[PDB]
Design a protein around this ligand. Structure first.
Ligand SMILES: O=c1[nH]cc(F)c(=O)[nH]1
Ligand SMILES: O=c1[nH]cc(F)c(=O)[nH]1
Ligand SMILES: [Mg+2]
Ligand SMILES: [Mg+2]
Ligand SMILES: [Mn+3]
Ligand SMILES: [Mn+3]
Ligand SMILES: [Mn+3]
Ligand SMILES: [Mn+3]
Lengths: 486, 486
């Protein structure tokens, strides 16, 4: 056995995980000195020549703390039942009944350029023929499919990791922070995909009529989604600190319950869900620790499981404060969820102080989207609310999501390439970067003439020192392309 | 020459048109007695055994009166310039620039199961190979294309006709009324199609962002269109009596001006438009009369020319009453036009008495959508406004267009077939009618359980006495199909 405490959590066995990556995927696009207080790749550990800091492993201990924190309270049982049944019912009425996912289709759906997790820690492509897994992964997949078809429980193993992403300089040179990732094992992946693939697809095709926006296109779908939010009087942001680690399994189980009953094979899906939500085994390297609470984020369905819990919690707080039936608040409101990310629009007169408190009571840590210091605030125009890193703007033509210039400028300073030790290194000219460049041009168009021109230059210099030179379109032409599509 | 008065209008030459059709396309679906005061095919003339009435030709004289009526006043010149430039400008900003239509593409686009008009009065298919006109129509088309390519004027000839459609019983057994149709000549058709096809397609792809809804799908597009209308505070119907005959050519010319400047071949399009709006030659049979005013409705672009004039008139009245810039009222409002059919939604505080008057002054005859006795009224919910024979309903899921039951029941009493003299005759079982039947089932779904079931029966009896028997779906399944699509 072991057991055994690590990072505040019970040790369940010895670890098998590779060492945490000590490298970043991001290369500077230009050799010149970086704009002051500009974002950089997150901390890379001891071998990181930018600052001396703790080991990556100590950074991860830090990320594990909240998972041993005392859970918040459950919402009132009567309210929780009402909102669950309402959500479920709305889903019965909107989801197109789907036919069961095959083994072939589950394997196909998986991202082939990411790790297989426990036990082989292979990249998924290495054992993939184009249509089936063979070799080692062939074994893991096949065994899992057998367990799935025979409704037999199998215990999932997650591999912990630290997200390589651009962060504010503070999180590098001030108090060092780096976000925790859970990596599902391939077995669990295929098992969850077969079970819940059909439900997730059903949900994804309902991305505009139902509040879970997973699978949406900001450009094509945003204007209709935002127009719906604008039918209602009051609008609010809410951001959440540490969403994943503050979740209650009890609530996750209710989200899971809804997912089961709406799956085309409920008896087989129940075994899968029970395993997913059973106390979780997480491989930190030296050990596999037990993480009883919070969200286990490794799998294909996770982002929708997470959004569904979010839907439940928002309604519970709303119902609790307003005292209107969950079904009726859903006719007086429009919601958008994507993991921790919410926009609530309503006609109900919601007490924003009592709303914040009711959420805080559930164990959540709400903050405003770009404002700081709560309670949460409501506004009487959608104009300026934020969702998915975009500002919601609205004009003569309609609503849209606009990426702020700080973000555009940022994507022009850094490019994605092979893993390497020094962030500041330049590679050669990225002729894999004409697709990205068009989108960015498009993103800048929405900021008007003067800004567009200034990124048009930056884009052209880069298109020169590259194997493909570009027709840089006129402002009005690209604006028209971005806003009006298709 | 001639000249010569007929129906209050100058006679320009002798007619060449076939006699007015004395038959209807509508067959009863059932032999049994018709529900009291139910709609029937419009009057068929002397040979019509339902009632004794005037000849079809006297019915048409009646329809020609308003075209010799004194025109209403033009809107204030300054306002007309402002709104034209605004509309044009909005179109510059939204329309995707198009490439010129070829001869092949113009010929392709034309409806092949309708008459070629002057001079051959042939059905268009009779001289069509699948890719080109040959024979007589080959000559007419080719000559017209030459005139078009050489920017040479050619004078259009319209053939008058009377619409075969279902009407309220009053228009048969009370005061006899039958609607006038203008049939373009094939030459003019191809000339207008080459010239204005590109503009019409550009416009059609902008059907949600721009107020001209030609080409929209009620089912797919309605919910987004209606959600936009719902962003605004006040909503209104307006129906118009005799829209086409009360139009001013001067205003039609401004709509035409906008269409020209946004066409990819403006110099060639100008010749076409000038001909279209020049005093019109209309063949009533015995004579070709001159109709100086009103809308000439024969052609491919007509419905958009008509909607564009409508856009101009609405804004002119709105600007005139509110005194806000046309561009600004377009940021405080959402419009829908389809020929004579309008929904105006606004946040502006519009004086509905002064609005009605300003319209009446332009020569228009506004009435409420289903209310009678003006001024026009505004409502503070879109809920219940009508557009394109549909009621706009809105619920938990969103907005939609619902066809009223009187209309559904109606489509179940009558079916389309070959022309014949007695409306009341039944044909056999229509196994060309399973597509129509599904849609109707779908239309009825939106009226809830009890109604749906009652048309489910009516539909099944009919599907029995037919060469294809049908799986009649459960209510919730079809409702879900109708509302949520695709
Ligand atoms: O609200 C959020 N926005 C973006 C994120 F990456 C996240 O975790 N939460
Ligand atoms: O507003 C209208 N609705 C339907 C019609 F046929 C018409 O001409 N006008
Ligand atoms: Mg957040
Ligand atoms: Mg009308
Ligand atoms: Mn989608
Ligand atoms: Mn969708
Ligand atoms: Mn369209
Ligand atoms: Mn459109």
């Amino acid at each position: 056995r072991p057991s055994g405490t690590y990072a505040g959590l019970p040790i369940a066995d010895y670890g098998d995980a590779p060492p945490l990556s000590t490298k970043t995927m991001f290369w500077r696009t230009s050799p010149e000195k970086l704009p002051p207080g500009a974002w950089e790749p997150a901390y890379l550990g001891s071998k990181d020549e930018r600052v001396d800091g703790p080991s990556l492993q100590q950074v991860m201990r830090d990320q594990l703390k909240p998972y041993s924190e005392p859970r918040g309270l459950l919402p009132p049982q009567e309210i929780l039942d009402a909102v669950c049944d309402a959500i479920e019912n709305r889903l019965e009425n909107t989801l197109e009944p789907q036919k069961p996912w095959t083994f072939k289709k589950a394997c196909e759906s998986l991202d082939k350029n990411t790790s297989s997790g426990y036990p082989y820690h292979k990249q998924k492509s290495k054992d993939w023929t184009g249509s089936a897994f063979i070799g080692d992964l062939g074994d893991q997949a096949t065994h899992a499919n057998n367990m799935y078809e025979m409704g037999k429980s199998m215990r999932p193993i997650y591999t912990a990791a630290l997200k390589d992403e651009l962060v504010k300089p503070d999180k590098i040179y001030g108090k060092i922070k780096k976000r925790l990732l859970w990596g599902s094992d391939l077995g669990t992946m295929i098992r969850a995909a077969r079970a819940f693939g059909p439900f997730c697809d059903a949900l994804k095709e309902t991305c505009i009529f139902n509040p879970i926006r997973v699978g949406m296109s900001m450009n094509e779908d945003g204007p209709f989604i935002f127009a719906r939010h604008a039918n209602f009087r009051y609008h609010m942001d809410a951001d959440y600190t540490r969403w994943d680690s503050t979740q209650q399994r009890a609530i996750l189980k209710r989200a899971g319950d809804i997912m089961v009953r709406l799956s085309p094979e409920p008896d087989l899906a129940r075994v899968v869900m029970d395993d997913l939500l059973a106390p979780s085994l997480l491989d930190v390297g030296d050990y596999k620790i037990v993480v009883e609470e919070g969200l286990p984020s490794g799998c294909p369905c996770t982002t929708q499981l997470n959004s569904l819990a979010h839907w439940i919690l928002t309604l519970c707080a709303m119902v609790e404060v307003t005292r209107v039936d969950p079904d009726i608040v859903m006719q007086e409101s429009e919601f958008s969820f994507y993991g921790d990310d919410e926009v609530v629009s309503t006609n109900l007169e919601l007490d924003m102080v009592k709303y914040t408190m009711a959420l805080r009571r559930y164990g959540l840590l709400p903050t405003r989207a770009d404002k700081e210091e709560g309670p949460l605030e409501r506004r009487q125009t959608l104009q300026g609310i934020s969702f998915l890193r975009r500002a919601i703007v609205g004009d003569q033509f309609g609503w849209y999501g606009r990426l702020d210039r700080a973000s555009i400028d940022r994507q022009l300073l850094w490019t994605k390439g092979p893993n390497h030790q020094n962030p500041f290194e330049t590679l050669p000219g990225h002729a894999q970067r004409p697709s990205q460049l068009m989108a960015l041009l498009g993103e800048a168009a929405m900021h008007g003439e003067k800004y567009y021109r200034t990124v048009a230059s930056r884009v052209s210099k880069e298109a020169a020192q590259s194997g493909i030179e570009m027709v840089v379109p006129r402002h009005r032409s690209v604006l028209r392309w971005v806003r009006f599509g298709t």
